[PDB]
Amino acid sequence: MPTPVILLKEGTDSSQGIPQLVSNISACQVIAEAVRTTLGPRGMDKLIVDGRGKATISNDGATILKLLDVVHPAAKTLVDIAKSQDAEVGDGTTSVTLLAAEFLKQVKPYVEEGLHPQIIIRAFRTATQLAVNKIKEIAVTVKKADKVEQRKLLEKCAMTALSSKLISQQKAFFAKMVVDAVMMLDDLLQLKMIGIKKVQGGALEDSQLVAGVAFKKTFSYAGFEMQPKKYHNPKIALLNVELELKAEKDNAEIRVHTVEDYQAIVDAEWNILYDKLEKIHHSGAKVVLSKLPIGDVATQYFADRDMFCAGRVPEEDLKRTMMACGGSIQTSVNALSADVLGRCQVFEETQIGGERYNFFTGCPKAKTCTFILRGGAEQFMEETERSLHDAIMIVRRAIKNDSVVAGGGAIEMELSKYLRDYSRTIPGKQQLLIGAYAKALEIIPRQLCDNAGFDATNILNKLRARHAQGGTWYGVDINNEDIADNFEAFVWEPAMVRINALTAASEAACLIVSVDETIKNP
Amino acid sequence: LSVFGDRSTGETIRSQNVMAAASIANIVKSSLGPVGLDKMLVDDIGDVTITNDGATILKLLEVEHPAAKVLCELADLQDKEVGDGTTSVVIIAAELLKNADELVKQKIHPTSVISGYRLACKEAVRYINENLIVNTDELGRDCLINAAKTSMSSKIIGINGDFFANMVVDAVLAIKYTDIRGQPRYPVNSVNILKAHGRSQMESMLISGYALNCVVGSQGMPKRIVNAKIACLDFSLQKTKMKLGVQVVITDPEKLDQIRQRESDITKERIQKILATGANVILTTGGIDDMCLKYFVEAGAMAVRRVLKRDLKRIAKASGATILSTLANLEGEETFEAAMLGQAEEVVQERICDDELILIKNTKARTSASIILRGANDFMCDEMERSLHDALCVVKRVLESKSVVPGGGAVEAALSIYLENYATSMGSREQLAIAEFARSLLVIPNTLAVNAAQDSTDLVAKLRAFHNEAQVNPERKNLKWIGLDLSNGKPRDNKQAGVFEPTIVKVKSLKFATEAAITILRIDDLIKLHPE
Amino acid sequence: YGRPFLIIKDQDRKSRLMGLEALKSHIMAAKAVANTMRT
Amino acid sequence: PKAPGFAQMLKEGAKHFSGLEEAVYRNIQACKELAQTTRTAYGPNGMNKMVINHLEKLFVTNDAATILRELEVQHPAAKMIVMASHMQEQEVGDGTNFVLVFAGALLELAEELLRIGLSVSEVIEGYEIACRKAHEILPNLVCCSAKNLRDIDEVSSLLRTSIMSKQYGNEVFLAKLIAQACVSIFPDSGHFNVDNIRVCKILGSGISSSSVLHGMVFKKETEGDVTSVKDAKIAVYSCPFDGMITETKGTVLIKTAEELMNFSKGEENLMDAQVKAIADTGANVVVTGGKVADMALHYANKYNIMLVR
Amino acid sequence: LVLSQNTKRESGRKVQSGNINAAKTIADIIRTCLGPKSMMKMLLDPMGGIVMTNDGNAILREIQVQHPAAKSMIEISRTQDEEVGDGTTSVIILAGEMLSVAEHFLEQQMHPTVVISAYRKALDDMISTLKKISIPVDISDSDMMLNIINSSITTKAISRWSSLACNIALDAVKMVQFEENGRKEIDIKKYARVEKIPGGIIEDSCVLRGVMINKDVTHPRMRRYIKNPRIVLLDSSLEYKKGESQTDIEITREEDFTRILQMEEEYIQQLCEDIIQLKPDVVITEKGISDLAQHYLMRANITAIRRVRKTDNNRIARACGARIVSRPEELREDDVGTGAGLLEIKKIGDEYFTFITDCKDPKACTILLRGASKEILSEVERNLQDAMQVCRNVLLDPQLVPGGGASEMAVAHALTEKSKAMTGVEQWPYRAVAQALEVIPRTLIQNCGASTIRLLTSLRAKHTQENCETWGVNGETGTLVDMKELGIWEPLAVKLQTYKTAVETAVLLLRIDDIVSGHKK
């Protein structure tokens, strides 16, 4: 019984062409609608719970999209870009997805026309590149100007940046925190240095920034409560090496006939720990830290001599600590000297939310701080941190790049107008693409007004008319609910954000449109 | 909170129906215009059906979602009102729905959208009458030739149309009929069409009369009658009944033979009474007994049993016969009159595709037209008649309305821009809907071009330009034009090309489309209910 | 065009409640909590 | 009915094909599928394509071989041509597209002559000799035998065609950077082996901001500080950075007390002396993939040396 | 869930190729079966029986499929078979191959409509071509018809028996001409009854000057042998038949019941004497026969047959020219069974048969098929069916065609002559169809098994000379042969619908773009 031979595996699914192509575009639109509401001064955030039952709220879509495990292929690309732009610049990743599908959306009818995607992407490259340069041209710096303190602009950017996520009512609060905090990050400039302490409870308005490090952590040993917990001007020891009687050291059997030698040996093992401790004590310092466990007894010795100690510490916070106090973490107790020995303005340790924390700050030269984040909801913490995270990295680039632009959709409206007139220059099939490129482009405020529940059409026609001649940074006000100089209303953005945004979107469709069929393997 | 099914509201259902409609559109998007490609469906068991007309396709398409069924039934109605535009009208429905939805998909108030659409249709048809072209001045036969072959395009038979349309136009002028005493109404579906696989449509023949999908009852009975002696009789011929309950009781056996005798003699004498008139052709939808068969052979007569009711009605109207449900008289005796006879030149049963079907030639009382179909398979004939079925209607409408519209999509080409300017008149927000109305209305040439598979926009753009030009320099007698082509992929004058369509087609099309989207657009929520 | 296509796994049982309906649903639950503790 | 006979039950369930029918029909069609599979593939106008593997991994592609690599095809002759260009790709690179096109076309007319009654063997020879003749006539069409070894401009203009075919959008950047790459590499290990090129993938910062380095990268962490010296003194050690533990199970043993002190103490000083002797050579960086001694890095920071991991 | 809930759909080139492929299969499965050197196929009916037959129609008529166009192709076969009988040996093989190249422009991105457009152009010239290269023939001359018939039948297994059938086919065909249509008399092949009886040999089967009945005398006393009998066709039954009005009797007196029973006796006898008054000899009826009357009709020594099938009664009536009667009292002597040269009832071996011979100028006749086994017989008559069918077509048109592919090449270059002179994009389709035509002689080569390519090129080269058009391909030698001496001659109309059907197939499948299943109604 012969059978006609299959080409590929049973159930190897494929679908080709426009019906294939258009389907993805729909999925993109489906994706966007999951995020359309999100960003905005009156924007939106979502909650998603896993199969494990852990709830998860978020306002930055990339996190949400990461939560939203896509099964479709082409949609993952959209998810992929979010991580890119999130790993690049932060919020507006929200908008970034809006960028793509809307770019997808307007061409989709032109896709119904049997247009070679290469044509479409050809303008897309043309449009983005031409768009990009105009961004650079109308970008705004301040260091040529005179009325900027090096942080005010950073201060303004975050307020702008912060004016979308869950702590929107306290932007004026945290903005100073992060800017002066980020003022410390020089010049490693990396987020790993600065810790975040998701301390439960307390009003987030009482959340703290310490010009030092605190420990959300500890562990109970015997005397760990007994010793003094105030050290007004202490000296800080950082040990990586553990402190215990040969708990986990080199493995060796020993052989001894004589009891006294047996006697002598066990005594000697102790003298080992004492000898380090003597080195520990005779250092004259008062605080010792260890990633490793510490013998309980030494604590008593430290308690007996009223020195503080702590073991099993996170090295990261220890890494902060050494980067905070300038002292050097040690593995050799004997080669110790005061040069590697940390000093701090004052050390303490305080109860916060019942939790047992360890306090030390005031180091004049400490390029690393930590964020004590009070808050009564578990979900708030990571959400805030994600908000906190974005705030830091975005201003970090701002520190890197003294280029700013107004927000409130003004930029895009300016672009759409510029390209709109430019489309008149270029005849033919490209011209239609340019307008739609502009026609997709304007969407961002429209959703904002949608998320404001306003009549964006009046706003848009007003805007387009008002953006015809009278001023560049005229843009939407949420509160006055119409056009405003959001720049003078101080809605200020780093160019790179939208710069990378549109470019990443540009390739996305250029990636997106460039496929004719799908193939599936079980 | 209702059991056995939930609900979804707003955009979710809103877009959902849009997704439903667009799905419907793409099903038929390839079978329209002179380059549309016809569809076929395996039923479930191989009794497949190839056809280009969506109204068939939709009617043969099972639907479960509501809104789509609206379109299918709507597709049916326009078919019941036009017959084609099935090529187009549903395509119009979803696309206008597509764009209108998109506006609301942002914020736009639906009722506002409805209102502009209301105006848009009224605006359109008024200008339609302001752009009309009349066929009265034109050569009657010529334009009917033109529109038919225009209608013959997109169909299986479009190559042979000239033969076909010529065949068709003769049929309708042969189906002339005097109406309410003031109209010459021309009855469609009155023409008889018989499908028969075999020879080519090259050999397909029109009957200057009627043709019967029937045979001679009696093999011994003669076959062809050169005379006009023709009757129809609804009254069946069997041994006459008691026909309600009337019992026959015998206490005196001596007359049962006489009883049983007359049982058939009644039928016999009825045979004799009608035969004595000398009638040579008879039909009876009722059953015909062999006793009658024998008698007619003795007459060498001609008779038919089980003829479909409508055709013999056409026969009586054709031959001038009186269909007779029975024999009677204003006096009680059942009598029969020669004046009841129908008359025609010659009647033959002829074996086409080895099957003898009966032909009627030239009834003198009322001229008749019927058409014999020849083709390869049964699949080909039953579809081509539908095109033929639609073929009649359009010409009938042209006869019905002595006025023409040029074919080949000029309509929206003119409409789009004229509305585009007209949109600016209102100053409201509805002109956007007007603009999308026009924008969505632009779909047809795009469908044409994709169905012709070339660069559509540029064709559209050129079509936009000349029509836009047709709205510049009001000296348009030498600036107003109309036309577009696809085979050569460039615009033309369909008026010169003869590419014409009936006005009523697009008229009801837009209106029926207008109503449909209105119905669909106002929806905002669906609720499911599981069965018992 | 119209035909099923797969986006997020278990999409049939991946239910989703949105907007005003969702919000009130929280409220009724919240009130349940509120009344549950009232005494 | 319901009971035909078999003259050879030789098979316990398998597919035996015969009568040339598969060859004349089934063999051809499968090939024709492959042509249809990748007909769109090549071309500056040819568009990319994506497929998911059996392990649900994304692959956007324009190169035939790679996507071909993603297809568990089961027709035997399918694989033949598949692996054919596969090695062909292994040999030259792009052309996979082309050869498959050659494949189908050569097949496509072949059955036609076979169906026309041309001898399969004679088909083979004629197909053979013509190819040989093609080789003969090929060289006489070379024009502009570009020669400049180490210019950027020539090859940039040259290599673009490969780029444009499989990327029509960004030729200028991509041309210069590989041209930047190619000119940067000279005949050192023997005439610019391809493997002498490394690639790093970093998300974000769209293609225009992609760059090329006259050095090499690692997307890995660090242990002490981060510095550059224009006179970089590097230490390289496939050995893991720690005291050389005997592969044999050699367990340190003691007999008396004072062993313990000196035991830990001595180990410390020797590693310091180990790293010191390294530091005295001025090597400001040591590199290894292997296991790293903790006090050593403690010493390494003490002498402020870079470590690689 | 939206559209039709698990009804599959497909569109475009994949559909296009799929239909292209299936027909390629569809034609292919039979390419072995045409030509005097053809093969012969035996089939399993689903319910157990066996049919062995070369005629493609029944083969395909005996084919179950799932893909539609095949079934679409199926009917096309049976339709032309119905209209023409043979060519089914070839038409479909023409058809798919036409499609086989027809696809070749699909990759040429040429819209099929034009390709159709050329086709309609192509056939027009083709029909015009054949009319130019047709040859009318006299119809009175028997031998050429016999030559034509063998020319028509030297393709099937009865080839060894050409002499018998040719006359056999001719004789029945000639004797069926119903002139009451003026000079528009028409023959019928349903009055051309065929009776297959196993046993005996092909040589024993013969044309009977009359009708054969698989029934027997109702009573022995009726003679089984008569020279010039008189025959009665009583459409009505011979017995007492219901008083149709739910009649009822209420007797009260004793003699009444016995009286009535005589009355039915009386009623029956009444019928008998009405029959005898015309002095008949033979009684035939589709219904039953009272033995009591049959006693009477025995008493009159008048031959009687009961419950005879109506079509045979007609042919029996058409045998002896008499007309059937349902009314013994209204029976008319103009329908006396006169026209009966001999009456007999033989014993075939376990079966009586009714022997009705030597009608004066009979119009109806049945052919008696006496062979080996009914499947053999059934195969024979199918070939007979084709044999007689073409003859009436010859009786329908006297214009003849030389086959053997000779005509095929003739158009082929003729269209090539048309092709080069018809500049445009449509030219390439035009020659392509001409390219399609060449396969049939080529196919003939394989069925012979010769060097097809060389012979074909030479034949085309042979047919490049205008001086010679009857050059075709011999069945057995596989050599180029002018037809005039070869004599394989064919009805022109046979070839017309052949191409007519062929091209119709092409267009119909070409406009397709889509598949829809699960109609559920």
Coordinates of N, CA and C in Angstrom, one line a residue, chain D residues 113-223:
Chain D
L113 N 11.5 16.3 -20.7 CA 12.2 15.5 -21.7 C 12.1 14.0 -21.4
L114 N 12.1 13.7 -20.1 CA 11.8 12.3 -19.7 C 10.4 12.0 -20.0
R115 N 9.4 12.8 -19.8 CA 8.1 12.6 -20.2 C 8.0 12.7 -21.7
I116 N 8.8 13.5 -22.4 CA 8.9 13.4 -23.9 C 9.5 12.2 -24.4
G117 N 10.1 11.4 -23.5 CA 10.7 10.1 -23.9 C 12.2 10.2 -24.0
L118 N 12.9 11.2 -23.5 CA 14.3 11.3 -23.6 C 14.9 10.3 -22.6
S119 N 16.0 9.7 -23.0 CA 16.6 8.6 -22.1 C 17.2 9.2 -20.8
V120 N 16.8 8.6 -19.7 CA 17.3 9.1 -18.4 C 18.8 9.1 -18.4
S121 N 19.4 8.0 -18.9 CA 20.9 8.0 -19.0 C 21.4 9.1 -19.9
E122 N 20.7 9.2 -21.1 CA 21.1 10.2 -22.1 C 20.9 11.6 -21.5
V123 N 19.8 11.7 -20.8 CA 19.5 12.9 -20.0 C 20.7 13.2 -19.1
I124 N 21.2 12.2 -18.4 CA 22.3 12.4 -17.5 C 23.5 13.0 -18.3
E125 N 23.9 12.3 -19.4 CA 25.1 12.7 -20.2 C 24.9 14.1 -20.7
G126 N 23.8 14.4 -21.4 CA 23.6 15.7 -21.9 C 23.6 16.8 -20.8
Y127 N 22.9 16.5 -19.7 CA 23.0 17.4 -18.6 C 24.5 17.5 -18.1
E128 N 25.2 16.4 -18.1 CA 26.6 16.4 -17.7 C 27.4 17.3 -18.6
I129 N 27.5 16.9 -19.9 CA 28.4 17.5 -20.8 C 28.2 19.0 -20.9
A130 N 26.9 19.4 -21.0 CA 26.6 20.8 -21.1 C 27.2 21.5 -19.9
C131 N 27.1 21.0 -18.7 CA 27.7 21.6 -17.6 C 29.2 21.8 -17.8
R132 N 29.8 20.7 -18.3 CA 31.2 20.8 -18.6 C 31.5 21.9 -19.6
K133 N 30.7 22.0 -20.6 CA 30.8 23.1 -21.6 C 30.6 24.4 -20.9
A134 N 29.7 24.5 -20.0 CA 29.4 25.7 -19.2 C 30.7 26.1 -18.5
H135 N 31.3 25.2 -17.8 CA 32.6 25.5 -17.2 C 33.6 26.0 -18.2
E136 N 33.6 25.4 -19.4 CA 34.5 25.9 -20.4 C 34.3 27.3 -20.8
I137 N 33.0 27.7 -20.9 CA 32.7 29.0 -21.4 C 32.6 30.0 -20.3
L138 N 32.5 29.6 -19.1 CA 32.4 30.5 -18.0 C 33.5 31.5 -17.9
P139 N 34.8 31.2 -18.0 CA 35.8 32.1 -17.6 C 35.9 33.3 -18.6
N140 N 35.4 33.1 -19.8 CA 35.5 34.2 -20.8 C 34.6 35.3 -20.6
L141 N 33.9 35.3 -19.4 CA 32.9 36.4 -19.1 C 33.4 37.2 -17.9
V142 N 34.5 36.9 -17.3 CA 35.1 37.7 -16.2 C 35.3 39.1 -16.7
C143 N 34.9 40.1 -16.0 CA 35.2 41.5 -16.3 C 35.5 42.1 -14.9
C144 N 36.4 43.1 -15.0 CA 36.8 43.8 -13.8 C 37.3 42.9 -12.6
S145 N 38.3 42.2 -12.9 CA 38.9 41.2 -12.0 C 39.6 42.1 -10.9
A146 N 38.8 42.6 -9.9 CA 39.2 43.5 -8.9 C 40.4 42.9 -8.1
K147 N 41.4 43.7 -8.0 CA 42.7 43.2 -7.4 C 43.2 43.9 -6.2
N148 N 42.8 45.1 -5.9 CA 43.4 45.9 -4.8 C 43.2 45.1 -3.5
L149 N 44.3 44.7 -2.9 CA 44.3 43.8 -1.7 C 43.7 44.5 -0.5
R150 N 44.3 45.7 -0.1 CA 44.0 46.3 1.2 C 43.4 47.7 1.1
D151 N 42.8 48.0 0.0 CA 42.0 49.2 -0.1 C 40.6 49.0 0.6
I152 N 40.1 50.0 1.1 CA 38.7 49.9 1.7 C 37.7 50.1 0.6
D153 N 37.9 51.0 -0.3 CA 36.9 51.4 -1.2 C 36.5 50.3 -2.2
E154 N 37.5 49.7 -2.8 CA 37.2 48.6 -3.8 C 36.2 47.6 -3.2
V155 N 36.7 46.9 -2.2 CA 35.9 45.8 -1.6 C 34.6 46.3 -1.1
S156 N 34.6 47.5 -0.5 CA 33.3 48.1 -0.1 C 32.3 48.1 -1.2
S157 N 32.7 48.7 -2.3 CA 31.9 48.6 -3.5 C 31.7 47.1 -3.9
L158 N 32.7 46.3 -3.7 CA 32.6 44.9 -4.0 C 31.6 44.2 -3.1
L159 N 31.9 44.1 -1.8 CA 31.1 43.3 -0.9 C 29.7 43.7 -0.8
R160 N 29.4 44.9 -1.2 CA 28.0 45.4 -1.1 C 27.0 44.5 -1.7
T161 N 27.4 43.9 -2.9 CA 26.5 43.1 -3.6 C 26.0 41.9 -2.8
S162 N 26.9 41.3 -2.1 CA 26.5 40.2 -1.1 C 25.6 40.8 -0.1
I163 N 25.9 42.0 0.4 CA 25.1 42.6 1.4 C 23.7 43.0 0.9
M164 N 23.7 43.6 -0.3 CA 22.5 44.1 -0.8 C 21.5 43.0 -1.1
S165 N 22.0 41.9 -1.6 CA 21.2 40.7 -1.9 C 20.5 40.2 -0.7
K166 N 21.2 40.1 0.5 CA 20.6 39.7 1.7 C 20.4 40.9 2.7
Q167 N 20.7 42.1 2.3 CA 20.2 43.3 3.0 C 20.2 44.4 2.1
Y168 N 19.0 44.8 1.5 CA 18.9 45.9 0.6 C 18.8 47.2 1.2
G169 N 18.7 47.3 2.6 CA 18.4 48.5 3.2 C 19.5 49.3 3.7
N170 N 20.6 48.7 4.2 CA 21.6 49.4 4.9 C 23.0 49.1 4.4
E171 N 23.1 49.1 3.0 CA 24.4 48.7 2.4 C 25.6 49.5 2.8
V172 N 25.4 50.9 2.9 CA 26.5 51.7 3.1 C 27.2 51.5 4.4
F173 N 26.5 51.4 5.5 CA 27.1 51.1 6.8 C 27.7 49.8 6.7
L174 N 26.9 48.8 6.4 CA 27.4 47.4 6.4 C 28.6 47.2 5.5
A175 N 28.6 47.8 4.4 CA 29.8 47.7 3.5 C 31.0 48.2 4.2
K176 N 31.0 49.4 4.7 CA 32.2 50.0 5.3 C 32.8 49.2 6.4
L177 N 31.9 48.7 7.3 CA 32.3 48.1 8.6 C 33.0 46.8 8.3
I178 N 32.5 46.0 7.4 CA 33.2 44.7 7.1 C 34.4 45.1 6.3
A179 N 34.3 46.1 5.4 CA 35.5 46.6 4.8 C 36.5 47.1 5.8
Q180 N 35.9 47.8 6.8 CA 36.7 48.2 7.9 C 37.3 46.9 8.5
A181 N 36.5 45.9 8.7 CA 37.0 44.6 9.2 C 38.1 44.0 8.3
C182 N 37.8 43.9 7.0 CA 38.7 43.1 6.2 C 40.0 43.8 6.1
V183 N 40.0 45.1 5.9 CA 41.3 45.8 5.8 C 42.1 45.7 7.1
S184 N 41.4 45.7 8.2 CA 42.0 45.6 9.5 C 42.8 44.3 9.6
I185 N 42.3 43.2 9.0 CA 43.0 41.9 9.1 C 43.9 41.7 7.9
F186 N 45.1 41.4 8.2 CA 46.2 41.1 7.2 C 46.5 39.6 7.1
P187 N 47.4 39.2 6.2 CA 47.8 37.8 6.2 C 48.7 37.5 7.3
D188 N 48.2 36.9 8.4 CA 48.9 36.6 9.6 C 49.0 35.2 10.0
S189 N 47.8 34.5 10.2 CA 47.7 33.1 10.4 C 47.6 32.4 9.1
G190 N 47.7 33.1 8.0 CA 47.5 32.6 6.7 C 46.3 33.2 6.1
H191 N 46.4 34.4 5.4 CA 45.5 34.9 4.4 C 44.0 34.9 5.0
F192 N 43.9 35.7 6.0 CA 42.6 36.2 6.5 C 41.5 35.1 6.6
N193 N 41.8 34.2 7.5 CA 40.8 33.2 7.8 C 39.5 33.9 8.3
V194 N 38.4 33.4 7.9 CA 37.1 34.0 8.4 C 37.0 33.9 9.9
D195 N 37.4 32.8 10.5 CA 37.3 32.6 11.9 C 38.0 33.6 12.7
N196 N 39.0 34.3 12.0 CA 39.7 35.4 12.7 C 38.8 36.5 13.0
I197 N 37.5 36.4 12.6 CA 36.5 37.5 12.9 C 35.6 37.0 14.0
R198 N 35.4 37.9 15.0 CA 34.5 37.7 16.0 C 33.4 38.7 15.9
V199 N 32.2 38.3 16.4 CA 31.0 39.2 16.3 C 30.4 39.2 17.7
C200 N 30.0 40.4 18.1 CA 29.2 40.6 19.4 C 27.9 41.2 19.1
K201 N 26.9 40.6 19.8 CA 25.5 41.0 19.6 C 25.0 41.8 20.8
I202 N 24.6 43.1 20.5 CA 24.1 43.9 21.6 C 22.8 44.5 21.2
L203 N 21.7 44.3 21.9 CA 20.4 44.8 21.6 C 20.4 46.3 21.8
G204 N 19.4 46.9 21.2 CA 19.2 48.4 21.3 C 20.2 49.2 20.4
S205 N 19.9 50.5 20.4 CA 20.8 51.4 19.6 C 20.9 51.0 18.1
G206 N 19.8 51.3 17.4 CA 19.6 50.8 16.1 C 20.8 50.8 15.1
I207 N 20.7 50.0 14.1 CA 21.8 49.5 13.3 C 22.8 50.6 13.0
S208 N 22.3 51.8 12.7 CA 23.3 52.9 12.4 C 24.3 53.1 13.4
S209 N 24.0 52.9 14.7 CA 24.9 53.0 15.8 C 25.7 51.8 16.0
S210 N 25.5 50.7 15.3 CA 26.4 49.6 15.4 C 27.8 50.0 14.9
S211 N 28.9 49.4 15.5 CA 30.2 49.8 15.3 C 31.1 48.6 15.1
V212 N 32.4 48.9 14.9 CA 33.4 47.8 14.7 C 34.6 48.2 15.4
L213 N 35.3 47.3 16.1 CA 36.4 47.5 17.0 C 37.7 46.9 16.4
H214 N 38.8 47.6 16.4 CA 40.1 47.1 16.1 C 40.6 46.2 17.2
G215 N 39.7 45.9 18.2 CA 40.1 44.9 19.2 C 39.1 43.8 19.4
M216 N 38.8 43.4 20.6 CA 37.9 42.3 20.9 C 37.3 42.6 22.2
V217 N 36.1 41.9 22.5 CA 35.2 42.2 23.5 C 34.9 41.0 24.4
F218 N 34.4 41.3 25.6 CA 33.8 40.2 26.4 C 32.7 40.9 27.1
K219 N 31.5 40.2 27.1 CA 30.3 40.7 27.8 C 30.2 40.1 29.2
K220 N 31.3 40.3 30.0 CA 31.5 39.6 31.2 C 31.8 40.6 32.3
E221 N 31.8 40.1 33.5 CA 31.9 41.0 34.7 C 33.4 41.2 35.0
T222 N 33.7 41.8 36.2 CA 35.0 42.2 36.6 C 35.1 42.0 38.1
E223 N 36.3 42.0 38.6 CA 36.5 41.7 40.0 C 37.0 42.8 40.9

